[PDB]
Every structure is written in C-alpha cells, then in structure tokens.
Design a protein around this ligand. Structure first.
Ligand SMILES: CC(=O)N[C@@H]1[C@@H](O)[C@H](O[C@@H]2O[C@H](CO)[C@@H](O)[C@H](O[C@H]3O[C@H](CO)[C@@H](O)[C@H](O)[C@@H]3O[C@@H]3O[C@H](CO)[C@@H](O)[C@H](O)[C@H]3NC(C)=O)[C@@H]2O)[C@@H](CO)O[C@H]1O
Length: 411
C-alpha cells in the first residue's frame, strides 16, 4: 500500500494508425509528448481496417504453398488503398517502426502494436483476393467488407501466418501484442455480429481463433491483448476463452449488442486495461454529431475516474486494472489530424491524474547527456546521487530544482 502502486500502472495513448496514415515524425512527437506528460506506453494500431505496416520480408507460408514477399507487399498496399488511399502515405516501413521503438525506449515509453482480426481487416481481405485466395469475407445480411469468414481455412491459415510474421517482429521488442477481435461483421449484420455468430453456431469457431492468437502471442514471449467485445458474450460460459489475455475494456455495448460486464470478466480471472469509451476522440468529430467529439472527451477526462471501467461506477465497483488507455480514432480517415487537439486531450487526462502520471524527465535526460579536479567532481557526483526518478506530475517543481543543481554542478 505504498507510493509505487499508482506510478506502476500503465498510462497509454492510443493512435488509430490503421485507418489513417501517420508519419514516423508525427508518431515520434506523440511519443515525446507522452513522455513529457508522464504516459508509460503508446498503443499503436497498425492493422485496423487498413494495414499500414510492411516488414522487409513479407514472405508468407500457408496452405501448402508460399506467397512471395513482393507479391504480398503489393497486395497489401492495394488493400489499404482500396479501403482508403491516404494522400499522406500508405504504410510504415520496418526501419521506421524499428526506430520508433528504440526512440520510445530512450524516453521510458513502451510501444503496444495492434494488428486487428477477424474484424477491421478490409485491407487484408482484398489483399487475399489479389493473392488468389477466393472469397475471404464473411457472409450474412450481405457480403462483409471488414470481416473474415471463419469457415474458410485458406483465409484463416494465411491470416494466422501473417499475424505470426508480425508477432515474430515485435517479439523481444515489445511486451504486449494486441490482436483486437472487436466488432465482428458489424457492417454485414447491422452491428449485431456476436448474435449472428451464436445463431449460426460459429461463436465457438471465433473462440478457437482468438485462443490460437493468444497462444501465438505467449509462445513468442508477448503478452496477448484483445478487446472485450467477443469475450464471454452475454455472460455465457458455454464457450471458454484463454484467461491469459489482457482485456482492453472499452464498452459493455448497447441494445442488441450484449457484451460481457467487467464484473463477469473479472470473475473469470481477467485483468483489464481500462480503455474507457468516455475518453474517445474521433478525428474531425463535432459536437453536433454526438458520440466522441473533442469537448466531451476533455470534459469526461475529469468526469470519468482513472480506475472506472465502462458501464461501472467507481469506487462502488472496484475491479483489478493494470492501468488506463485514452484512445484517438480515425473512423473517417480523411479528417485532418490536428496535433494540437490530441495534445490537449492528452494533457487534460494527465492533469486530472497527476498522481498516476510521471513527472517530465526530458530536461533531466538532456542534462545527463552533457556529462563527460576532485572538489568539482564531488559536486557533480552529489547532484547525481540526489536525482529522483520516481517523481509524479504533482512534483515537477521538486524535479526542476534537482536538475538545476545538476546544471550548476556541471559548470
Ligand atoms: C442508449 C444506447 O445504448 N444507445 C445505443 C447507441 O449508443 C448505439 O450507438 C453506439 O454508440 C456508442 C457510444 O455509446 C458508439 O461507440 C458506437 O460506435 C461504435 O460502433 C459502431 C458500429 O455500430 C462503429 O461504426 C464505430 O466505429 C464504433 O466502434 C468503436 O468505437 C470507436 C470510435 O467510435 C472506433 O474507432 C473503434 O474502431 C470501435 N471499437 C473500439 C474497440 O473502440 C455506436 O455508434 C446504437 C447502435 O445502433 O444503438 C443505440 O441503442
């Protein structure tokens, strides 16, 4: 019950770089601002509708045949462009994402990648078509454009191998890997995908796929993360799920979309990354549209407590969370990304929870990088011993004089 508990928790900013393209430098500045504000990780969706990340070797081995690296790359580029041909760019390179991870590591910032499936995979579906894999899309009220058919082995096998190749990359580089599994065939079932899975006795098939993805993460030394949607839908435990999955809990849903309660998932032994929907911001969203516009997300950043999970009340309901995630989405990826908006929402969330967030260590690290008579060395050694790396956002002044004493000793 000491000091450490609050600071040990995760403070995450989520960027939807799957739907919309973000430049390496844009993400670097988000990472820098995250480090400055006191965040711990940057959650970066790279596969979300579009697939905006290419490895150097994209060779895939599936269905007793292989798909050549250059053939895979072109098909993915075409898929992402088919979803949305972003004039700012198509997909991040291996070298760019690698530099982002090392840059973030230098600022005590984790990177949490997300490659979504079996929903939110418009780019992958079309890529598979271009790769010869016929009809990968789910089929209900109409043929889906976002979701994979669970009965199609050819598509399932490829996608598993594809996510596996990404998982091979992020292994040893990042602690967590998010595979999503949210909003199954929402476009093809009027946002009732889990009800449709139940109906056609395919919900067990989804579990098998999700559990496979969790094992794939674990055996590669990655903590599996997924969204809550498809985990124990409607509090039924007829179909079981992997318990080692870090659940990013965003909502309990709405009418006809009966997601499991946080209370039920906690009773199954799950830990939560509090990804409360209240803190959502969709780029370009205005107050007139309702939902997650900027003013509401800033307003709710103080309204909705740090530990409070969606559909629950804190502290009346107090469930185990590893930390909280604030999310920026790009539902309409053509909307202008304005850095100032995200920075304001990020700042607000940190300012209301100064006990959870770190202090600003950018000044300290610059002054420690300037370090190359024994009496003058006595002072330089003394200021170094007096440094405190454990400060939170409430004590910026406390840290400001400690770094000032280091600057004075160095001269
Ligand atoms: C009182 C009541 O419950 N009314 C229902 C109403 O709320 C429902 O509309 C829904 O509202 C929620 C907010 O409470 C909103 O989040 C929902 O949007 C999600 O789902 C739609 C598909 O229906 C999808 O188009 C959106 O993209 C969105 O999905 C998530 O949200 C973010 C940002 O919006 C996305 O970027 C994410 O990709 C996605 N997933 C995650 C994990 O974040 C929805 O509009 C309606 C529904 O008919 O029903 C009322 O009864």
């Amino acid at each position: 019950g000491s000091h450490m508990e609050k600071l040990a928790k995760n403070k995450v900013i989520s960027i939807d770089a799957g739907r919309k393209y973000f430049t390496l430098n844009q993400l670097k500045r988000i990472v820098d601002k995250a480090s400055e504000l006191g965040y711990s990780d940057v959650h970066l969706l790279l596969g979300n509708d579009g697939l905006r990340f290419l490895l150097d070797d994209m060779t895939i081995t599936a269905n007793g045949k292989t798909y050549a690296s250059d053939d895979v790359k072109k098909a993915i580029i075409e898929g992402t462009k088919a979803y949305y041909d972003d004039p700012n760019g198509t997909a991040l390179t291996q070298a760019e994402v690698t530099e982002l991870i090392e840059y973030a590591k230098s600022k005590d910032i984790g990177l949490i990648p997300a490659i979504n499936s079996p929903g939110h995979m418009d780019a992958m579906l079309v890529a598979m078509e271009k790769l010869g894999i016929k009809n990968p899309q789910a089929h209900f009220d109409k043929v889906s454009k976002t979701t994979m058919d669970l009965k199609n082995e050819e598509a399932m096998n490829f996608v598993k191998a594809l996510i596996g190749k990404y998982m091979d990359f992020f292994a040893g580089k990042t602690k967590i890997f998010n595979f999503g599994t949210d909003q199954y065939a929402n476009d093809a079932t009027s946002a009732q995908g889990w009800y449709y899975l139940k109906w056609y006795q395919l919900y067990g098939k989804f579990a098998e796929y999700a559990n496979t993805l969790a094992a794939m993460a674990k055996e590669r030394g990655l903590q599996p993360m997924a969204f809550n949607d498809g985990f124990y839908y409607e509090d039924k435990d007829d179909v079981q799920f992997d318990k080692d999955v870090l659940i990013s809990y965003w909502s309990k849903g709405w009418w006809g979309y009966n997601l499991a309660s946080p209370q039920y998932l906690a009773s199954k032994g799950y830990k939560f990354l509090n990804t409360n929907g209240d803190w959502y911001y969709i780029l370009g969203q205005k107050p007139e549209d309702g939902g997650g516009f900027l003013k509401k997300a800033i307003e709710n950043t103080g309204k909705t407590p740090f530990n409070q999970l969606a559909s629950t009340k804190y502290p009346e309901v107090d469930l185990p969370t590893v930390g909280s995630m604030l999310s920026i989405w790009a539902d309409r990826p053509s909307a202008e990304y304005k850095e100032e908006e995200i920075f304001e929402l990020m700042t607000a969330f940190a300012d209301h929870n100064k006990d959870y967030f770190r202090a600003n260590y950018n000044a300290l690290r610059e002054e420690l990088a300037k370090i190359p008579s024994k009496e003058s060395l006595e002072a330089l050694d003394a200021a170094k011993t007096a440094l405190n790396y454990n400060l939170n956002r409430n004590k910026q002044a406390e840290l400001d004089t400690l770094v000032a004493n280091l600057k004075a000793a160095l001269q």
